[PDB]
């Protein structure tokens, strides 16, 4: 019975010590509890947006920490089965670092233009039998134009649980794991990407080890 | 996980209060093609070009004083029921050190 | 390739009922992963209407006790002239040190805080 | 208690924004 | 070499068509037949780059390498 | 292949062209289902027949839905909504009544 990979590692929360990779202090030190102006604030973003500091929204640190924990746990347990994670960042704020982290890990990124269907019509531009991404981590869903990334609709149109670093200008309508947080500060995105790299790397390492030990049975 | 109240209280962006006529010092977060977007915490970073008086010391990890003026920069134009953000600050530069 | 219409909200129940039907012969893999770690706010496809009339958004405005201290410091004396780093957490300098000293001396005053304010100002300036 | 955000009396209030006729008819 | 093909076209393959494409130009298709992208995945997907879903992964990978070289040079200093 | 596709509406919409003018076109709407609680509409149109049929079949099998049904006789309760202009007035009856409604609703 080599099917223990679908039971043993899933019967525990934060098995890879995901709660220790970050914390409330780690977020407070990176200025993640910030938000853009409250002018174009989204309706469904009000519960997350705790307060404001003169046209500057502030998000509760506990909610953001819990969302980060859940999203990282899900991403790790998905990579535990070669879960093809997909990054998105068209704002050009940290596309270089995001691509470098994706290279260091086994995930991929889609920080370029969305042509004639890259996920809904991936049978023509690519091969016929191509496993589509089972997870999308929107690093910067807000592109240069006043409009969120269109990949959310494509993901919803293909049954894909997506993660997103949502903010005040975002629209967490169909995101399965919204991650409220700041997107203007550089240290915030740096910490985000470092945590992602470490988490996915540890997930892949534990995957290899445990899968080998189980198949050896 | 320490105290959530103290951490939310004592923070740089909240400690600086309403940025207005505050000389802030910082470094450049990313070299620009022909500008000088110097960072300094807060909510946004200033925007300007290289000055004529000493314009080489500006490096990725330096310390140059700014002024911090209007960290929002927004204005409801005509029919736009919402705001039009620019993600800038625009402040008068002082010098080096 | 599964039910993807965003009319319900979450895809977990969609895939579950589809597998129960008989279409999806073999399950993917994320089933147990989602079963073990459910989300906080489920993406229930709700009409994202715009706040029109009295539909207000009770969003409290954050205001700390140091607001009055900073107001007094910048009204009596000049504006913020000290160089602030603001990169590393809880940075300290001269104006920040003065604000910290004021917070330490507040409350426990009752009598008059302007006296201690002027005392600290004169000690820092002379 | 004191380290939490509590709406105060709204400081940073500018006096009466007089235009030109501050007190000279 | 091409001497045999020339002799053949001159003797036992004189079409005479004015055009220059439909003429008898029999040649080893090892170089004439163009090539396209071979396999784009392997063991459980896994393309050849992290920009596979962006279409034309080679061009974008080259652009990212050029940007990395740009940043490295910046750090250093037809 | 287990899905049973059926034809529903076929209107003789006269679509414009250029050299001929008004040409008879068809708007296909296939319903993909196979009992047990499965059903799915379709979208698409063209001038041919089998082409539009298979296009609708594809667009339907793509966006499918398995209605959470109760048992092999009736759903759960009566639902009443107003989709723009239509009016839904369904009634839950036990064994001994029959499918008394529109032929299209009967097929659905
Ligand atoms: Zn922001
Ligand atoms: Zn007046």
CSV table of N, CA, C and O in Angstrom, one decimal, chain A residues 95-203:
chain,number,residue,atom,x,y,z
A,95,UNK,N,9.1,41.6,-11.2
A,95,UNK,CA,9.1,40.5,-12.1
A,95,UNK,C,10.4,39.8,-12.2
A,95,UNK,O,10.4,38.5,-12.3
A,96,UNK,N,11.5,40.5,-12.1
A,96,UNK,CA,12.8,39.9,-12.1
A,96,UNK,C,13.0,39.0,-11.0
A,96,UNK,O,13.4,37.8,-11.1
A,97,UNK,N,12.8,39.4,-9.7
A,97,UNK,CA,12.9,38.6,-8.6
A,97,UNK,C,12.0,37.4,-8.6
A,97,UNK,O,12.4,36.3,-8.2
A,98,UNK,N,10.7,37.6,-9.0
A,98,UNK,CA,9.8,36.5,-9.0
A,98,UNK,C,10.2,35.5,-10.0
A,98,UNK,O,10.1,34.3,-9.7
A,99,UNK,N,10.7,35.9,-11.2
A,99,UNK,CA,11.2,34.9,-12.2
A,99,UNK,C,12.4,34.2,-11.6
A,99,UNK,O,12.6,33.0,-11.9
A,100,UNK,N,13.3,34.9,-10.9
A,100,UNK,CA,14.5,34.2,-10.4
A,100,UNK,C,14.1,33.2,-9.3
A,100,UNK,O,14.6,32.1,-9.3
A,101,UNK,N,13.1,33.5,-8.5
A,101,UNK,CA,12.7,32.6,-7.5
A,101,UNK,C,12.0,31.4,-8.1
A,101,UNK,O,12.2,30.2,-7.7
A,102,UNK,N,11.2,31.6,-9.2
A,102,UNK,CA,10.6,30.5,-9.9
A,102,UNK,C,11.6,29.6,-10.5
A,102,UNK,O,11.5,28.4,-10.5
A,103,UNK,N,12.7,30.2,-11.1
A,103,UNK,CA,13.8,29.4,-11.6
A,103,UNK,C,14.5,28.6,-10.5
A,103,UNK,O,14.7,27.4,-10.7
A,104,UNK,N,14.7,29.2,-9.3
A,104,UNK,CA,15.3,28.4,-8.2
A,104,UNK,C,14.5,27.3,-7.8
A,104,UNK,O,15.0,26.2,-7.4
A,105,UNK,N,13.1,27.4,-7.9
A,105,UNK,CA,12.2,26.4,-7.5
A,105,UNK,C,11.7,25.7,-8.8
A,105,UNK,O,12.2,25.9,-9.9
A,106,UNK,N,10.7,24.8,-8.6
A,106,UNK,CA,10.1,24.1,-9.7
A,106,UNK,C,8.9,24.7,-10.3
A,106,UNK,O,8.2,24.0,-11.2
A,107,UNK,N,8.4,25.8,-9.8
A,107,UNK,CA,7.2,26.4,-10.3
A,107,UNK,C,7.5,27.3,-11.5
A,107,UNK,O,8.6,27.5,-11.9
A,108,UNK,N,6.4,27.9,-12.1
A,108,UNK,CA,6.5,28.7,-13.3
A,108,UNK,C,5.8,30.0,-13.1
A,108,UNK,O,5.1,30.2,-12.1
A,109,UNK,N,6.0,31.0,-14.0
A,109,UNK,CA,5.4,32.3,-13.9
A,109,UNK,C,4.8,32.7,-15.2
A,109,UNK,O,5.3,32.2,-16.3
A,110,UNK,N,3.9,33.6,-15.2
A,110,UNK,CA,3.2,34.1,-16.3
A,110,UNK,C,3.2,35.7,-16.2
A,110,UNK,O,2.1,36.3,-16.2
A,111,UNK,N,4.3,36.3,-16.1
A,111,UNK,CA,4.5,37.7,-16.0
A,111,UNK,C,4.5,38.4,-17.3
A,111,UNK,O,5.1,39.5,-17.4
A,112,UNK,N,3.9,37.9,-18.3
A,112,UNK,CA,3.9,38.5,-19.7
A,112,UNK,C,2.4,38.6,-20.1
A,112,UNK,O,1.5,38.2,-19.4
A,113,UNK,N,2.2,39.1,-21.3
A,113,UNK,CA,0.9,39.3,-21.9
A,113,UNK,C,0.1,38.0,-22.0
A,113,UNK,O,0.7,36.9,-22.2
A,114,UNK,N,-1.2,38.1,-21.8
A,114,UNK,CA,-2.1,36.9,-21.9
A,114,UNK,C,-2.6,36.9,-23.3
A,114,UNK,O,-3.6,37.6,-23.6
A,115,UNK,N,-2.0,36.1,-24.2
A,115,UNK,CA,-2.5,36.0,-25.6
A,115,UNK,C,-3.8,35.2,-25.7
A,115,UNK,O,-4.5,35.1,-24.7
A,116,UNK,N,-4.1,34.7,-26.9
A,116,UNK,CA,-5.3,34.0,-27.2
A,116,UNK,C,-5.4,32.8,-26.3
A,116,UNK,O,-5.2,31.6,-26.8
A,117,UNK,N,-5.8,33.0,-25.0
A,117,UNK,CA,-6.0,31.8,-24.1
A,117,UNK,C,-4.8,31.0,-23.9
A,117,UNK,O,-4.4,30.1,-24.7
A,118,UNK,N,-4.1,31.3,-22.7
A,118,UNK,CA,-3.0,30.5,-22.4
A,118,UNK,C,-3.3,29.3,-21.5
A,118,UNK,O,-2.5,28.4,-21.4
A,119,UNK,N,-4.5,29.3,-20.8
A,119,UNK,CA,-4.9,28.2,-20.0
A,119,UNK,C,-6.2,27.6,-20.4
A,119,UNK,O,-6.4,26.4,-20.3
A,120,UNK,N,-7.2,28.4,-21.0
A,120,UNK,CA,-8.4,27.9,-21.5
A,120,UNK,C,-8.3,27.3,-22.9
A,120,UNK,O,-9.0,26.3,-23.2
A,121,UNK,N,-7.4,27.8,-23.7
A,121,UNK,CA,-7.1,27.3,-25.1
A,121,UNK,C,-5.7,26.9,-25.2
A,121,UNK,O,-5.0,27.3,-26.2
A,122,UNK,N,-5.1,26.2,-24.3
A,122,UNK,CA,-3.7,25.8,-24.3
A,122,UNK,C,-3.5,24.5,-25.2
A,122,UNK,O,-2.4,24.0,-25.1
A,123,UNK,N,-4.5,24.1,-25.9
A,123,UNK,CA,-4.3,22.9,-26.8
A,123,UNK,C,-3.8,23.2,-28.2
A,123,UNK,O,-3.3,22.4,-28.8
A,124,UNK,N,-3.9,24.5,-28.6
A,124,UNK,CA,-3.4,24.9,-29.9
A,124,UNK,C,-2.0,25.5,-29.8
A,124,UNK,O,-1.0,25.1,-30.5
A,125,UNK,N,-1.8,26.6,-29.0
A,125,UNK,CA,-0.5,27.2,-28.8
A,125,UNK,C,0.5,26.2,-28.2
A,125,UNK,O,1.7,26.4,-28.4
A,126,UNK,N,0.1,25.2,-27.5
A,126,UNK,CA,1.0,24.2,-27.0
A,126,UNK,C,0.5,22.8,-27.4
A,126,UNK,O,-0.3,22.6,-28.3
A,127,UNK,N,1.1,21.7,-26.7
A,127,UNK,CA,0.7,20.4,-27.0
A,127,UNK,C,-0.7,20.0,-26.6
A,127,UNK,O,-1.3,20.8,-25.9
A,128,UNK,N,-1.2,18.9,-27.0
A,128,UNK,CA,-2.5,18.5,-26.6
A,128,UNK,C,-2.6,18.0,-25.2
A,128,UNK,O,-3.5,18.3,-24.5
A,129,UNK,N,-1.7,17.1,-24.8
A,129,UNK,CA,-1.6,16.6,-23.5
A,129,UNK,C,-0.6,17.4,-22.6
A,129,UNK,O,0.6,17.0,-22.6
A,130,UNK,N,-1.1,18.4,-22.0
A,130,UNK,CA,-0.2,19.3,-21.2
A,130,UNK,C,-1.0,19.6,-19.9
A,130,UNK,O,-2.0,20.2,-19.9
A,131,UNK,N,-0.4,19.1,-18.8
A,131,UNK,CA,-1.0,19.3,-17.5
A,131,UNK,C,-1.1,20.8,-17.2
A,131,UNK,O,0.0,21.5,-17.1
A,132,UNK,N,-2.3,21.4,-17.0
A,132,UNK,CA,-2.4,22.8,-16.7
A,132,UNK,C,-2.1,23.1,-15.2
A,132,UNK,O,-2.1,22.2,-14.4
A,133,UNK,N,-1.8,24.3,-14.9
A,133,UNK,CA,-1.5,24.7,-13.5
A,133,UNK,C,-2.7,24.4,-12.6
A,133,UNK,O,-3.8,24.9,-12.9
A,134,UNK,N,-2.4,23.7,-11.5
A,134,UNK,CA,-3.4,23.5,-10.5
A,134,UNK,C,-3.4,24.5,-9.3
A,134,UNK,O,-4.1,24.3,-8.3
A,135,UNK,N,-2.6,25.5,-9.5
A,135,UNK,CA,-2.5,26.6,-8.5
A,135,UNK,C,-1.9,27.8,-9.1
A,135,UNK,O,-0.9,27.7,-9.8
A,136,UNK,N,-2.4,29.0,-8.8
A,136,UNK,CA,-2.0,30.2,-9.4
A,136,UNK,C,-1.8,31.2,-8.2
A,136,UNK,O,-2.8,31.6,-7.5
A,137,UNK,N,-0.6,31.7,-8.0
A,137,UNK,CA,-0.2,32.6,-6.9
A,137,UNK,C,0.0,34.0,-7.6
A,137,UNK,O,1.0,34.2,-8.1
A,138,UNK,N,-1.1,34.8,-7.5
A,138,UNK,CA,-1.0,36.1,-8.1
A,138,UNK,C,0.0,37.0,-7.3
A,138,UNK,O,-0.4,37.5,-6.3
A,139,UNK,N,1.2,37.1,-7.8
A,139,UNK,CA,2.2,38.0,-7.1
A,139,UNK,C,1.8,39.4,-7.1
A,139,UNK,O,1.9,40.2,-6.1
A,140,UNK,N,1.3,39.9,-8.3
A,140,UNK,CA,0.8,41.3,-8.5
A,140,UNK,C,-0.3,41.3,-9.5
A,140,UNK,O,-0.1,41.5,-10.7
A,141,UNK,N,-1.5,41.0,-9.0
A,141,UNK,CA,-2.7,40.9,-9.8
A,141,UNK,C,-3.0,42.3,-10.4
A,141,UNK,O,-3.8,42.3,-11.4
A,142,UNK,N,-2.5,43.4,-9.9
A,142,UNK,CA,-2.8,44.7,-10.4
A,142,UNK,C,-1.7,45.1,-11.4
A,142,UNK,O,-0.6,45.3,-11.0
A,143,UNK,N,-2.1,45.1,-12.7
A,143,UNK,CA,-1.2,45.5,-13.7
A,143,UNK,C,-1.1,47.0,-13.8
A,143,UNK,O,-1.6,47.7,-12.9
A,144,UNK,N,-0.4,47.5,-14.8
A,144,UNK,CA,-0.1,48.9,-14.9
A,144,UNK,C,-1.4,49.7,-15.1
A,144,UNK,O,-1.6,50.8,-14.7
A,145,UNK,N,-2.4,49.1,-15.8
A,145,UNK,CA,-3.7,49.7,-16.1
A,145,UNK,C,-4.6,49.5,-14.9
A,145,UNK,O,-4.5,48.5,-14.2
A,146,UNK,N,-5.5,50.4,-14.7
A,146,UNK,CA,-6.5,50.3,-13.6
A,146,UNK,C,-7.5,49.2,-13.8
A,146,UNK,O,-8.6,49.4,-14.2
A,147,UNK,N,-7.0,47.9,-13.7
A,147,UNK,CA,-7.8,46.7,-13.9
A,147,UNK,C,-7.0,45.5,-13.3
A,147,UNK,O,-5.8,45.3,-13.7
A,148,UNK,N,-7.7,44.7,-12.6
A,148,UNK,CA,-7.0,43.4,-12.1
A,148,UNK,C,-6.6,42.5,-13.2
A,148,UNK,O,-7.0,42.7,-14.4
A,149,UNK,N,-5.8,41.5,-12.9
A,149,UNK,CA,-5.4,40.6,-13.9
A,149,UNK,C,-6.6,39.7,-14.4
A,149,UNK,O,-7.4,39.3,-13.6
A,150,UNK,N,-6.6,39.5,-15.7
A,150,UNK,CA,-7.7,38.7,-16.3
A,150,UNK,C,-7.5,37.2,-16.1
A,150,UNK,O,-8.4,36.4,-16.4
A,151,UNK,N,-6.4,36.8,-15.6
A,151,UNK,CA,-6.1,35.4,-15.4
A,151,UNK,C,-7.0,34.8,-14.3
A,151,UNK,O,-7.2,33.5,-14.3
A,152,UNK,N,-7.6,35.6,-13.4
A,152,UNK,CA,-8.6,35.1,-12.4
A,152,UNK,C,-9.8,34.4,-13.1
A,152,UNK,O,-10.2,33.3,-12.7
A,153,UNK,N,-10.3,35.1,-14.1
A,153,UNK,CA,-11.5,34.5,-14.8
A,153,UNK,C,-11.1,33.2,-15.6
A,153,UNK,O,-11.8,32.2,-15.6
A,154,UNK,N,-9.9,33.2,-16.2
A,154,UNK,CA,-9.4,32.0,-16.9
A,154,UNK,C,-9.2,30.8,-15.9
A,154,UNK,O,-9.6,29.7,-16.2
A,155,UNK,N,-8.7,31.1,-14.7
A,155,UNK,CA,-8.6,30.1,-13.7
A,155,UNK,C,-9.9,29.6,-13.2
A,155,UNK,O,-10.2,28.4,-13.1
A,156,UNK,N,-10.9,30.5,-13.0
A,156,UNK,CA,-12.2,30.1,-12.6
A,156,UNK,C,-12.9,29.3,-13.7
A,156,UNK,O,-13.8,28.4,-13.4
A,157,UNK,N,-12.5,29.5,-14.9
A,157,UNK,CA,-13.0,28.8,-16.1
A,157,UNK,C,-12.3,27.5,-16.3
A,157,UNK,O,-12.5,26.8,-17.4
A,158,UNK,N,-11.4,27.0,-15.4
A,158,UNK,CA,-10.7,25.8,-15.6
A,158,UNK,C,-10.5,25.0,-14.3
A,158,UNK,O,-9.8,24.0,-14.2
A,159,UNK,N,-11.3,25.4,-13.2
A,159,UNK,CA,-11.2,24.7,-11.9
A,159,UNK,C,-9.8,24.6,-11.4
A,159,UNK,O,-9.1,23.6,-11.4
A,160,UNK,N,-9.3,25.8,-10.9
A,160,UNK,CA,-7.9,25.9,-10.4
A,160,UNK,C,-8.0,26.8,-9.1
A,160,UNK,O,-8.4,27.9,-9.2
A,161,UNK,N,-7.6,26.2,-8.0
A,161,UNK,CA,-7.6,27.0,-6.7
A,161,UNK,C,-6.4,28.0,-6.8
A,161,UNK,O,-5.2,27.6,-6.7
A,162,UNK,N,-6.7,29.3,-6.9
A,162,UNK,CA,-5.7,30.3,-7.1
A,162,UNK,C,-5.4,31.0,-5.8
A,162,UNK,O,-6.4,31.3,-5.0
A,163,UNK,N,-4.2,31.4,-5.5
A,163,UNK,CA,-3.8,32.3,-4.4
A,163,UNK,C,-3.5,33.7,-5.0
A,163,UNK,O,-3.1,33.9,-6.1
A,164,UNK,N,-3.8,34.7,-4.1
A,164,UNK,CA,-3.6,36.1,-4.6
A,164,UNK,C,-3.2,37.0,-3.4
A,164,UNK,O,-3.9,37.0,-2.4
A,165,UNK,N,-2.2,37.8,-3.7
A,165,UNK,CA,-1.8,38.9,-2.7
A,165,UNK,C,-2.7,40.1,-2.9
A,165,UNK,O,-2.3,41.1,-3.4
A,166,UNK,N,-4.0,39.9,-2.6
A,166,UNK,CA,-5.0,40.9,-2.9
A,166,UNK,C,-4.7,42.2,-2.0
A,166,UNK,O,-3.8,42.1,-1.2
A,167,UNK,N,-5.3,43.3,-2.4
A,167,UNK,CA,-5.1,44.5,-1.7
A,167,UNK,C,-6.4,45.3,-1.7
A,167,UNK,O,-7.5,44.7,-1.9
A,168,UNK,N,-6.4,46.6,-1.5
A,168,UNK,CA,-7.6,47.5,-1.5
A,168,UNK,C,-8.1,47.6,-2.9
A,168,UNK,O,-9.3,47.7,-3.2
A,169,UNK,N,-7.2,47.7,-3.9
A,169,UNK,CA,-7.6,47.9,-5.3
A,169,UNK,C,-8.0,46.6,-6.0
A,169,UNK,O,-8.3,46.6,-7.2
A,170,UNK,N,-7.9,45.5,-5.3
A,170,UNK,CA,-8.2,44.2,-5.9
A,170,UNK,C,-9.7,43.9,-5.7
A,170,UNK,O,-10.4,44.6,-5.0
A,171,UNK,N,-10.1,42.8,-6.2
A,171,UNK,CA,-11.5,42.3,-6.1
A,171,UNK,C,-11.6,40.8,-5.7
A,171,UNK,O,-11.8,40.0,-6.6
A,172,UNK,N,-11.3,40.5,-4.5
A,172,UNK,CA,-11.4,39.1,-4.1
A,172,UNK,C,-12.8,38.5,-4.2
A,172,UNK,O,-13.5,38.3,-3.2
A,173,UNK,N,-13.2,38.3,-5.5
A,173,UNK,CA,-14.5,37.7,-5.7
A,173,UNK,C,-14.5,36.2,-5.9
A,173,UNK,O,-15.3,35.5,-5.4
A,174,UNK,N,-13.5,35.7,-6.7
A,174,UNK,CA,-13.4,34.3,-7.0
A,174,UNK,C,-12.1,33.7,-6.5
A,174,UNK,O,-11.9,32.5,-6.6
A,175,UNK,N,-11.2,34.5,-5.9
A,175,UNK,CA,-9.9,34.0,-5.3
A,175,UNK,C,-10.2,33.0,-4.2
A,175,UNK,O,-11.0,33.4,-3.2
A,176,UNK,N,-9.7,31.8,-4.3
A,176,UNK,CA,-9.9,30.8,-3.2
A,176,UNK,C,-9.1,31.1,-2.0
A,176,UNK,O,-9.6,30.7,-0.9
A,177,UNK,N,-8.0,31.8,-2.1
A,177,UNK,CA,-7.1,32.0,-0.9
A,177,UNK,C,-6.6,33.5,-1.0
A,177,UNK,O,-5.5,33.7,-1.3
A,178,UNK,N,-7.5,34.4,-0.8
A,178,UNK,CA,-7.1,35.8,-0.8
A,178,UNK,C,-6.1,36.1,0.3
A,178,UNK,O,-6.2,35.8,1.5
A,179,UNK,N,-5.0,36.8,-0.1
A,179,UNK,CA,-3.9,37.2,0.9
A,179,UNK,C,-3.8,38.7,1.0
A,179,UNK,O,-2.9,39.3,0.3
A,180,UNK,N,-4.6,39.4,1.8
A,180,UNK,CA,-4.5,40.8,1.9
A,180,UNK,C,-3.1,41.2,2.4
A,180,UNK,O,-2.5,40.6,3.2
A,181,UNK,N,-2.6,42.3,1.8
A,181,UNK,CA,-1.3,42.8,2.2
A,181,UNK,C,-0.9,44.0,1.3
A,181,UNK,O,-1.5,44.2,0.3
A,182,UNK,N,0.2,44.6,1.7
A,182,UNK,CA,0.7,45.8,0.9
A,182,UNK,C,1.4,45.3,-0.3
A,182,UNK,O,2.0,44.2,-0.4
A,183,UNK,N,1.4,46.2,-1.3
A,183,UNK,CA,2.0,45.9,-2.6
A,183,UNK,C,2.9,47.0,-3.1
A,183,UNK,O,3.6,46.9,-4.2
A,184,UNK,N,3.0,48.1,-2.3
A,184,UNK,CA,3.9,49.3,-2.7
A,184,UNK,C,5.3,49.2,-2.1
A,184,UNK,O,6.2,49.5,-2.8
A,185,UNK,N,5.4,48.8,-0.9
A,185,UNK,CA,6.7,48.7,-0.3
A,185,UNK,C,7.5,47.6,-0.9
A,185,UNK,O,7.0,46.6,-1.4
A,186,UNK,N,8.8,47.8,-1.0
A,186,UNK,CA,9.7,46.7,-1.6
A,186,UNK,C,10.0,45.6,-0.7
A,186,UNK,O,10.0,44.4,-1.1
A,187,UNK,N,10.2,45.9,0.6
A,187,UNK,CA,10.5,44.9,1.6
A,187,UNK,C,9.4,43.9,1.7
A,187,UNK,O,9.6,42.7,1.9
A,188,UNK,N,8.1,44.3,1.6
A,188,UNK,CA,7.0,43.4,1.7
A,188,UNK,C,7.1,42.3,0.6
A,188,UNK,O,7.0,41.1,0.9
A,189,UNK,N,7.3,42.8,-0.7
A,189,UNK,CA,7.4,41.8,-1.8
A,189,UNK,C,8.6,40.9,-1.6
A,189,UNK,O,8.6,39.8,-2.0
A,190,UNK,N,9.7,41.5,-1.2
A,190,UNK,CA,10.9,40.7,-0.9
A,190,UNK,C,10.6,39.6,0.0
A,190,UNK,O,11.0,38.4,-0.2
A,191,UNK,N,10.0,39.9,1.2
A,191,UNK,CA,9.7,38.9,2.2
A,191,UNK,C,8.7,37.9,1.6
A,191,UNK,O,8.8,36.7,1.8
A,192,UNK,N,7.7,38.3,0.8
A,192,UNK,CA,6.7,37.4,0.2
A,192,UNK,C,7.5,36.4,-0.7
A,192,UNK,O,7.3,35.2,-0.6
A,193,UNK,N,8.4,36.9,-1.5
A,193,UNK,CA,9.1,36.0,-2.5
A,193,UNK,C,10.0,35.1,-1.7
A,193,UNK,O,10.2,33.9,-2.1
A,194,UNK,N,10.7,35.6,-0.7
A,194,UNK,CA,11.6,34.7,0.1
A,194,UNK,C,10.8,33.6,0.8
A,194,UNK,O,11.2,32.4,0.7
A,195,UNK,N,9.7,33.9,1.4
A,195,UNK,CA,8.9,32.9,2.0
A,195,UNK,C,8.4,31.9,1.0
A,195,UNK,O,8.4,30.7,1.2
A,196,UNK,N,7.9,32.4,-0.2
A,196,UNK,CA,7.5,31.5,-1.2
A,196,UNK,C,8.6,30.5,-1.7
A,196,UNK,O,8.4,29.3,-1.8
A,197,UNK,N,9.8,31.0,-1.9
A,197,UNK,CA,10.9,30.2,-2.3
A,197,UNK,C,11.2,29.2,-1.3
A,197,UNK,O,11.3,28.0,-1.6
A,198,UNK,N,11.4,29.6,0.0
A,198,UNK,CA,11.7,28.6,1.1
A,198,UNK,C,10.6,27.6,1.2
A,198,UNK,O,10.9,26.4,1.4
A,199,UNK,N,9.3,28.0,1.2
A,199,UNK,CA,8.2,27.1,1.4
A,199,UNK,C,8.2,26.0,0.3
A,199,UNK,O,8.1,24.8,0.5
A,200,UNK,N,8.2,26.5,-1.0
A,200,UNK,CA,8.2,25.5,-2.1
A,200,UNK,C,9.4,24.6,-2.1
A,200,UNK,O,9.3,23.4,-2.4
A,201,UNK,N,10.6,25.1,-1.8
A,201,UNK,CA,11.8,24.3,-1.8
A,201,UNK,C,11.6,23.2,-0.7
A,201,UNK,O,11.9,22.0,-1.0
A,202,UNK,N,11.2,23.6,0.5
A,202,UNK,CA,11.1,22.6,1.6
A,202,UNK,C,10.0,21.6,1.2
A,202,UNK,O,10.1,20.4,1.5
A,203,UNK,N,8.9,22.1,0.6
A,203,UNK,CA,7.8,21.2,0.1
A,203,UNK,C,8.4,20.1,-0.9
A,203,UNK,O,8.1,18.9,-0.7
